[PDB]
């Protein structure tokens, strides 16, 4: 329905163990929702909500 950068609990499942973005071939998301999810993940990364990498 809608994707937001504030929803960290919904990005937790879509983000990889080390902090990388899981691809669409694995998740099964639509291209549009994937673009929005990538942008939201980048915003939560810049707002210190999700880690860039596991080892900082």
């Amino acid at each position: 329905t809608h994707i937001d950068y504030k929803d960290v609990e919904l990005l937790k499942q879509y983000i990889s163990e080390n902090g990388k973005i899981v691809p669409s071939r694995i998740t099964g998301t639509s291209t549009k929702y994937q673009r929005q999810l990538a942008t939201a993940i980048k915003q939560a990364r810049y707002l210190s909500l999700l880690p860039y990498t596991d080892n900082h």
């Binding site: 210190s48 909500l49 999700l50 860039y52 900082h56």
Partner: peptide, 12 residues
């Protein structure tokens, strides 16, 4: 709690 420390502070 911050995922990673920014400016040497863990929590902001």
């Amino acid at each position: 709690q911050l995922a990673y420390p920014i400016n040497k502070i863990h929590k902001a």
